[PDB]
Design a binder for these strands. Structure first.
Lengths: 237, 89, 103, 50
RNA sequence: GAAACUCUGAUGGAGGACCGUACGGGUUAUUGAUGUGCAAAUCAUUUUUCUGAUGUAGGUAAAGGUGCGAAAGACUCAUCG
RNA sequence: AAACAGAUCCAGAGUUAGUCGAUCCUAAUCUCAAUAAUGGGAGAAAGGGAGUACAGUUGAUAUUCUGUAACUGACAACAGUUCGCGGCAACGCAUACUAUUUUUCUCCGCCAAUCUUAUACCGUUGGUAGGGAUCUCUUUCCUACAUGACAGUACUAAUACCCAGGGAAACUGGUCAUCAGGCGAACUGCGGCGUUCUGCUGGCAAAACAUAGCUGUUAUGUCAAUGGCUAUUGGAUUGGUCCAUGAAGCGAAAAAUAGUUUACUGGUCACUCGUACCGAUAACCGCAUCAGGUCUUCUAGGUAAGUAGCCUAUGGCCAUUGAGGCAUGAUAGUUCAGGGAAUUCGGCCAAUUAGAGCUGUAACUUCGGGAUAAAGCUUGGCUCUGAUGAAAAUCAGAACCGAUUGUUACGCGGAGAGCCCAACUGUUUAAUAAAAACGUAGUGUCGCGCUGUGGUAGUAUAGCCAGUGAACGCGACAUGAAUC
RNA sequence: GUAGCGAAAUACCUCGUCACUUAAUUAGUGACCUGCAUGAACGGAGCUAUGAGGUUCUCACUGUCCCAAACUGUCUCUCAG
RNA sequence: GUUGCUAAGGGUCGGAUUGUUCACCCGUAUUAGGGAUCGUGAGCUGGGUUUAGACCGUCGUGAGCCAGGUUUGUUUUAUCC
């Protein structure tokens, strides 16, 4: 057999991110001990990422490409800190914020940059305050103990509802993955011959083998549904 | 004269792509081109610049909105949530 | 000299009937060009009547937006509409308002 | 060419001054006959590959 | 037309729309010519595409049980299960 | 084939730069070093990038040489001016240097429309120089009618933007089109300013070119008026499109805040390396002077919708063995009475159709299509008339004419009615398969919240890809538009 | 083995049986169904649009044919090299 | 008409479907069948059979298979005796 397209993404020659026109890494300023006001100089769109970024100035002018909540405008004053009040814009630690509210770009570790809840039209919800660890629900469903000192932007991330509209033409998806990375178009494994992929070969196109494989299964062998505790139509539940 | 009976903005696509998809995009393509009322300078000339971004021309300003309308319903709910908690206490 | 005969005939209208055409009506001389030629005549005419003092503030704005539609197809048709809408309107404007102000 | 480098030009010089017939007086001196100049060529037939 | 709106004409110039040029990109048919070829894959007539998922140049990245592949076991210097 | 010829052979000769390139900067990308570090270096003869033009000359060199006129940079002293003022304002006019920070120029996708310089071309009006043509006709036909970089300052007149007054619904102003305005419109200023424009100069007729005459040079002359519905190029004013938002760096100037202050205008020198010719047609790659292949530039007239096909000035050419025959046959072509697919596995092939204008267009349909559906008619030449524009253009109408013919050559769909497969634009076995195969949007399932997941990599406790990333996400599969 | 579809690009027996199509049809189209061996994202049924895709018929037009014939360009024929 | 003998000089066909040989119908001048390397591919054609692409159906866990079906698939040289 040959090495399979799933294995070949590691070696990373043509399968690298197209990172040329990307404006910078989206994160907070570092922590550095109250309250600090910060004007939104402008809000710009970087390629690949569906969200906007908003370039702040903590005037020297110290810059920070923070990811943009919805309802931010140019020449708003954003207020990072503990004793900053509640507006959509402001960047509070999880000690201060009320529970049962939608927050954006929340950090895992303090002073980190921002980790959970970054893509367009997403938000971490806050469940409740234990003592040190403010428990929050992530967009998927999963729940996470996160320390109260670490920061999070208030409100929902901008650019919501982009997949509501379908892309009618193959050309629209060509321009989508030009900004991101080469991973498209996908040739299906059944169509390929036996050497190229596991599902390939045979007189008539069909999978033949069970098509559902363990965590223990090797490189080359992990193809199709990996460790699928259910399959088929998820009716109810 | 009106010249298409049914189709509207999706007449550019012609016979392609199915009836159900052109109904769906008819709603969204009308939205993203439409000029919307500005908060700041007041005037009705807020166009879409990029995906999330909505530049007003005459202001010279921008706002972060939705993808295809400047107001997302879910983001508009978040204002009302932080209003009632700030107005309390 | 041979081409001079063909041009000098073509001015009088030889070699220019339906046989010796291969371009369409739009390809020969464009519908955009005939529009652009029209309304630049019609707007220049209305501009003159405003500066003369013949047409008012108010009668200009009606005829300007009528000229953006197909009301007028021609200079002569724009002039006779003005001569009509003077002769109908301005005899009444003078007549109705003048007498009924005092009475 | 044009836009040759200098050390490219140095090789093309040496390749054309070396291209000539063998002199007459060596056959008179040594008395050997049938010695050809090895670095003779023609431009059209054999390329240099330098 | 009571209204909600919808009839006629112009304006406008959208579309992985259409016809159609080339020392452009492809290569359907004649199973034509050639088959001691002009050519170790050509020629003629016909045919397909022609603002795009387009063509193309230089620099640069990926190397042999590997690479790369809109997938034909294709291609990797006339060499490839 | 022949040869005195040749890209062959032999002997000599030829490539001149501060301004064109390289050099200098970085891009994708590659490679060392440090971690007391926060980088250094490489990487483009199509990106960035200070500065040149004309005329002449050689057997071969020229934006390189000579003449003439510019321009840019660096290093020197030295002479004369000058120690901040105008406008309500937009802004104008003669002012330093070091540093820090901030901003700008350099500087950016594609498509579409309108307006306009320059160049080319066609034009109405004339004219003068030479040459061509002539049985007859033609006050004719052809050539020529030109001004570089660079520097200046007039008022004409533009659009963008800003300023002063002005203070808007009986809404007004404006575009080809969208539109603009109490966050201040129309409108008035011999406003401000940027970019284009017309005229008048300098350069500049001394040159160059064309006639006429003398033996190197002397004469006259290169003029006057004013359109483009034509094209290309530069620029201006705008619009549309994106789940696409379309380089960096060196360098340069400005501003602010400190501190130190006088400044401005007006001889010498400019290193290094490339420079000939071909660019397929015999100079490149195909073993060769191979009907193949290989990136780009300047782009005339007529016919026409035309960068089609056909014909011709300028320029370049006869590349190609000759002499004689003409039955048969091969191959590329016109044409064939009557029939019209009977031929053949099969209408393969060829023929018919065709451009434009005016009529007229069915079933079915995802209501957009089908549709150039189908099916009819007209088309020339010559003499006129009228309408629309500014306009030398284009469109409509009528006479009369002869072989009923006219998209005359050139170029240009045969059409309709069933059924199968794939929805569609697209991709594919270079050299027997272009398809129903691949692809796609759409639909669905599975895994994982970063000390993680899917890879890779190999002994250095190396760090690489997704990742400048975070579930509207990343990766793994299967189905393959819509409708039921 | 449900719904659809069904001598199908799947049906061996098979040139199945009965209509339409033709003067004449193992082809084509529409029905019936004892489906050798159909069948639902192994995706099932569908054809508005698109196709150098596969296949059947009608009209137009033709040297494909009855049945060949004539003419034209370059070669084949002779000579020199 | 049925049938026997001598006789191979002459005649023995146009079409529809099928790759067909064979068969079977429509039509005519009444109407036999064979051989020659199943005559005849440097004479043609390439429909079939029999490669590499691709689809369906049964079989096989699978690679793959199938006188089961369907579609696209290169036919060279005479100048020697």
């Amino acid at each position: 057999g040959h090495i399979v397209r799933a294995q070949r993404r590691g070696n990373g020659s043509v399968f690298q991110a197209h990172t040329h026109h990307r404006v910078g890494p989206a994160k907070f300023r570092a922590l550095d001990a109250s309250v600090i006001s910060g004007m939104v100089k402008e809000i710009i769109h970087d390629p690949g990422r569906g969200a906007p970024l908003a370039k702040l100035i903590y005037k020297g002018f110290d810059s920070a490409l923070v990811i943009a909540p919805e309802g931010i405008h140019t020449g708003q004053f954003i207020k990072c800190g503990a004793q900053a009040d509640l507006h959509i814009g402001n960047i509070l630690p999880l000690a201060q914020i009320p529970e049962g509210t939608e927050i954006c770009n929340v950090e895992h570790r303090p002073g980190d940059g921002g980790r959970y809840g970054r893509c367009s039209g997403d938000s971490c919800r806050v469940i409740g305050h234990t003592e040190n660890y403010t428990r929050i629900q992530l967009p998927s469903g999963r729940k996470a103990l996160v320390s109260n000192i670490c920061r999070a932007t208030l409100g929902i991330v901008a650019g919501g509802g982009r997949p509501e509209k379908p892309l009618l033409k193959a050309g629209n998806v060509h321009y989508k993955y030009k900004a991101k990375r080469h991973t498209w178009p996908v040739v299906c494994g059944i169509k390929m011959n036996p050497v190229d992929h596991r599902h390939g070969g045979g007189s008539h196109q069909h999978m033949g083998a069970p098509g559902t494989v363990a965590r223990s299964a090797r490189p080359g062998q992990k193809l199709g549904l990996i460790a699928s505790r259910r399959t088929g139509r998820r009716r109810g539940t | 004269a009106r010249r298409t009976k049914k189709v509207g903005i999706c007449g550019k696509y012609g016979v392609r792509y199915g009836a159900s998809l052109r109904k769906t995009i008819k709603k969204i393509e009308i939205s993203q081109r439409k000029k919307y009322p500005c908060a700041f300078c007041g005037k009705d000339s807020v166009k879409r610049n990029a995906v999330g971004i909505w530049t007003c021309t005459k202001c010279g300003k921008a706002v972060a909105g939705g993808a295809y309308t400047p107001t997302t319903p879910a983001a508009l709910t978040a204002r009302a949530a932080y209003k009632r908690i700030r107005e309390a206490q | 000299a041979r081409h001079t005969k063909r041009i000098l005939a073509k001015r009088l209208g030889r070699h220019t009937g339906y046989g010796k055409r291969r371009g369409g009506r739009n390809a020969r001389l464009t519908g955009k060009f005939q529009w652009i030629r029209r309304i630049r005549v019609l707007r220049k005419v209305l501009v003159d009547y405003r500066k003369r003092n013949e047409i008012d503030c108010h009668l200009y704005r009606k005829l300007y937006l009528k000229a953006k539609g197909n009301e007028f197809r021609n200079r002569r048709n724009l002039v006779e509409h003005i001569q009509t809408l003077k002769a109908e309107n301005l005899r009444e404007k003078t007549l109705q308002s003048q007498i009924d102000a005092r009475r | 060419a044009a836009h040759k480098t200098l050390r490219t030009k140095r090789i093309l010089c040496k390749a054309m001054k070396v291209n000539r017939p063998m002199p007459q007086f060596i056959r008179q001196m040594t008395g050997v006959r049938h010695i050809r100049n090895p670095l003779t060529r023609h431009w059209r037939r054999r390329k240099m590959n330098i």
